[PDB]
Design a protein around this ligand. Sequence first.
Ligand SMILES: *[C@@H]1O[C@H](CO)[C@@H](O[C@@H]2O[C@H](CO)[C@@H](O)[C@H](O)[C@H]2NC(C)=O)[C@H](O)[C@H]1NC(C)=O
Ligand SMILES: *[C@@H]1O[C@H](CO)[C@@H](O[C@@H]2O[C@H](CO)[C@@H](O)[C@H](O)[C@H]2NC(C)=O)[C@H](O)[C@H]1NC(C)=O
Lengths: 49, 48
Amino acid sequence: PQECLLLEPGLNEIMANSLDYNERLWAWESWRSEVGKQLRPLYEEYVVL
Amino acid sequence: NLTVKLQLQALQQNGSSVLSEDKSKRLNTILNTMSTIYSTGKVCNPDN
Ligand SMILES: *[C@@H]1O[C@H](CO)[C@@H](O[C@@H]2O[C@H](CO)[C@@H](O)[C@H](O)[C@H]2NC(C)=O)[C@H](O)[C@H]1NC(C)=O
Ligand SMILES: *[C@@H]1O[C@H](CO)[C@@H](O[C@@H]2O[C@H](CO)[C@@H](O)[C@H](O)[C@H]2NC(C)=O)[C@H](O)[C@H]1NC(C)=O
């Protein structure tokens, strides 16, 4: 857990180069489960305004 | 002689390397793992 990646230089590089089903799945799932879950209560409030 | 006995005793000690090679590598790995975890561990806020 001391190896945290950002999206730009390093996640969409895994997604663009790799061929390991499990590695792609880990990346795709974690990006949505760790960042997508913070944007929901903000998007629900942005829609109204 | 006490002096030469002291020197030879300081020099003779096996220390590590009395283990197997598997075991010694396994030990040197967890030492570095623990040191690195301590040196670069991070905690962050519950809200941001
Ligand atoms: C063995 O022990 C003797 C004394 O127990 C040491 O003798 C000393 O030697 C130094 C020079 O090397 C002298 O300046 C001292 O005065 C000596 N001490 C006595 C009480 O005479 C001897 O050095 C020891 N062995 C080695 C190799 O150092
Ligand atoms: C240091 O470790 C060695 C093994 O790596 C111990 O075993 C002795 O090693 C010497 C040198 O190969 C042999 O001649 C002896 O037959 C070995 N067995 C003995 C002495 O029982 C050695 O005893 C260790 N020494 C210390 C001071 O721990």
